[PDB]
Structures are given as structure tokens and as C-alpha cells.
Amino acid sequence: RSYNDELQFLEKINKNCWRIKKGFVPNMQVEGVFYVNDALEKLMFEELRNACRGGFLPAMKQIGNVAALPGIVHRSIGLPDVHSGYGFAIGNMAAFDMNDPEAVVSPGGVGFDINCGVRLLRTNLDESDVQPVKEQLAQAMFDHIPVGVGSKGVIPMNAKDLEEALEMGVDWSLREGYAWAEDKEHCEEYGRMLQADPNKVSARAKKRGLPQLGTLGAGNHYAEIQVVDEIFNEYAAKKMGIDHKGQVCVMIHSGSRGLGHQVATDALVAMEKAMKRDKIIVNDRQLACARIASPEGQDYLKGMAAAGNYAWVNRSSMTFLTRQAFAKVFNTTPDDLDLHVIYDVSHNIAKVEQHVVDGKERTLLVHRKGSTRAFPPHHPLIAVDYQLTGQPVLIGGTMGTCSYVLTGTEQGMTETFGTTCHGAGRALDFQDVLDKLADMGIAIRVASPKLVMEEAPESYKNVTDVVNTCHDAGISKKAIKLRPIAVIKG
Ligand SMILES: Nc1nc2c(ncn2[C@@H]2O[C@H](COP(=O)(O)O)[C@@H](O)[C@H]2O)c(=O)[nH]1
Ligand SMILES: [Co+2]
Ligand SMILES: [Co+2]
Asked: Does the beta carbon of 120 lie inside 6 Å of ligand 1?
């Protein structure tokens, strides 16, 4: 196929959405769509054009291949931050009818870092309160939070605790005093997936997992101190405790570390057998999957949920440590600093959700790999404080640019099953990067300084284009813009 031929199946629906017609890839059950603005459009097509003239297929082709998966409903959707990934693209949403016996679960549609995600903390501090002790604060966050490839947990944990954490999620953290009661209330799934079964997490996963529980990791993972730069939705900001520009917040991004990676890996191995036996055909081996009802599909879903709970405990630990560091620098209690959790969302998980599709409300398995749930106003499952706003959505940009808080919308619930973006996304000298941060007034403590070129803001897309695409499309609504002033990296 020539590049021009590829264009035959690509048709622009509206200002910010493209349609991927059936036939782009073989056996598509539904169409594919990708939401982008004029600036994001160029890169999608340039990547497709370069393929006509890595270990992953072009993002566009990955969206179509997921569209060929059995049991899918509605459309295979690529968000504006979409980039190529393992099987599913990072920034993709695919939902499956759980009453269809052909419907599958795909670990590639969740991701190796199971329940990678973001927690947003607010404070009653102002940028003028932090600027004088900025270096001291960053140092304190670094000393307190294990960060880096081989860092061990600070909060001591043994196998029993891990086992309880796999089953209980934030509830273990609450029970032992590391989490506040309100943290659980403002957390997606209330920090606890009930379907988790620690027996479906392997021994190797647990061995890897135990010393990393209570650690940040590396690469994209961060603890970032931010200032509210703009407020787009005053009402929503007020419900999140944010009332003025200058307010200081903390954003934490982490997942399930080695435990989750192993669980994902074990599932992929196990799924090869399931596919042959159950006659499952895929366009791409990275889309290896299992029938939801099969033992392979069920074992993975339960182990995924357990890894999910792990990640919530991990972000809870990070929060406790963060509160501790802030407390020390400012010689006050975390409560007097108003260091409450605004929200905690995943952007790597499969969820069982009720959704109207093809006229009837149905029970779907919603795969969100590199995308974020964004439930609308009046959804029964979200907390009382966000009933009128809709669900907060935490979008980290980069360490040198900006981040956003968005809210879920009814239109998002309709068009994308309440799914929006998760970040800027990857786009298609290390001392320079550090120097630039310093120029900008951004403090930083990094476990591995020579590797910061990889995490430079130039390697990601423009996050403001990504959120504005989702905003104009209507699937999530801008609420708050944040600016980093200090960041911890691995
Ligand atoms: N705020 C902030 N966001 C980041 C940083 N590094 C990566 N991100 C964002 O976090 C998102 C999550 O990454 P992912 O989970 O896809 O690997 C990325 O798409 C990227 O935009 C950082 O240092 N600070
Ligand atoms: Co991650
Ligand atoms: Co992430």
C-alpha cells in the first residue's frame, strides 16, 4: 500500500475528530476514531507516511487493530495524546460487551505498569511561602521519597502486608494510619478493587513487588510541587479546595512497580495458550487476549485488580511521605497545611462499567491504556463532592511546562464512555535540560541526572493542545492549569 492509499480510509468527521473506516486493517468489527487538533494532526499522518517509506506499528494502525478485537462495541478510540505502545496504543480506549461470549480481555490494553496514575494534593500554601525554601523543599521530598531504579521502601513491609495491600488497597493504608479517611473518598474506586485476588499474583511478582511498595520508580514517575496558574472553572476549583492563583499543589505519578509488570508479563505468556485453544485471531501478537469468562481472562482480571490495589497503596505511601516532608520544612502538621487529596485517577486499567451503547445500557469491560476515566456529573459512583462538577481528571504535562485538572462531562460519557487523555504523550544534552529548568526557576532532585534528556519537555507533545482538543470536543472540560516549581525524578 502506498501512503496515498492509506488516506482512502481516513476521513475527518468534525473540527477535532478523524474516522478510521473499516478495511484500514483486516477484520475491523467497528470503526476507529482519533481526536486531534490541526497541530496534533500533522504528526499522526507523518508517522503513517514514514511507515509506507521499531517494535510497534503506527498509532493509527494500532487503533484499527484493536477495532478488530472480538466483542468490542462502539469504536476503538485514540485520544489526542496517543502514541504507539504494546498492542494497544498508549492513549487508546476499547470497551467490550461482557454479555458477548466472544468478548476478550487484553493485557496489552491495560499496560505493563498496571494502575500507573496520578494523585493531586492541595495545600493552603502560596508560591511566595515556597519560593524562599524551594531548594530545601525539593531536597526534603527527595530524602523522604525513595526514588530511582533500586530504591527500597521506607515504610517497612513484609509479605503479610503486601498480601493485605493486594486485597485491600487504600484500606490497608487507612487502617495502618498512612492514609487519611478523605483520601479514600477522593480516589477512583475508593482505592479498592473488590475483585482483586492475591492468589492470582505470582510468587515472582510478589518477590519483586515487596521491596518496591512505597517507592516512586523512574522515567515518567515524579513527585511535583506546583502552583495554580489559572482557574478555568471557578466552581469546580472551589469544590477541589482551590480558590486562587498562587495556591500550591503536589502531583504524584506512579504505578504498580515490579509487581504489576510481572502480572502483566505473566498474563501475556499465559494468553498464548488461551488463544489457540479458544480460536482467537488477532492482527498483532501484541494484542494477545483471552475470553473474559475463560480461566485465563478471569485470572488476569483478578491479578490486575490486585496490582491496581498495590498501586493505590504505593501512591498512598508517597503521599504520607510527602506530607511528612512538607511538615518538616514548614514546621507544622500536614493538617494545618491543608494537605488533602483532591483526587486519584488511574490511566492504566480495565474497569467493569455500565454504559449506554446501541440504545441499551450494557455492562462493559472498558480498557483504558494511557487514558483516563472521566465520569460525568451526577454519576452515582463518584464522591459527593464531585457530584455537580463531574469527576476530576489529573493530566500531567512535563516537568518544564504545565499540568491541568479537567472534569468529566455527559458528552464524554456518551462519546467515549467517559474517557479522556492522560498526558501530553510522547511525540514522534542532559545538562542543557537541567540548565533550562534552572533558568525557569524550577528546582529538581533527580536520582539519575545523566538520563534527563529522555524526560525533556521536547520529547512530549504540547499538553495544552491535548487538553484543548479534548475540551473543544467536549469529552472533558478544563478546570485548572498548574505550573511546576520543583520536581523529584528517578
Ligand atoms: N507533570 C509532569 N508530567 C510528566 C512528567 N513526565 C511525564 N509526564 C507526563 O505524564 C504522562 C504519563 O506518562 P505515562 O503514564 O504515559 O508513561 C505522560 O504522557 C507525560 O505527559 C513530569 O516530569 N511532570
Ligand atoms: Co508508569
Ligand atoms: Co503513568
From this structure: no
- Is the CB of 302 within 6 Å of ligand 1? no
**Closest CA to ligand 1's atom 18:** 423
Distance between Cα 426 and ligand 1 center (Å): 9
Residue ranges per domain, the chain?
A: 1-490
Q: What separation in angstroms does the CA of 142 have from each of 127, 129, 179?
A: 20, 19, 20
Which of 422, 330, 318 shows the shortest CA–CA distance to 78? 422
C-alpha cell at position 359? 440504545
Active-site amino acid positions: 422
399 has binding-site annotation = yes
Resolution number, Å: 2.3
The bound ligand whose nearest atom lies closest to the alpha carbon of 346 is: 3
447 is in an annotated binding site: no
Listed residue (143, 267, 137, 256) closest to 208, CA to CA: 256
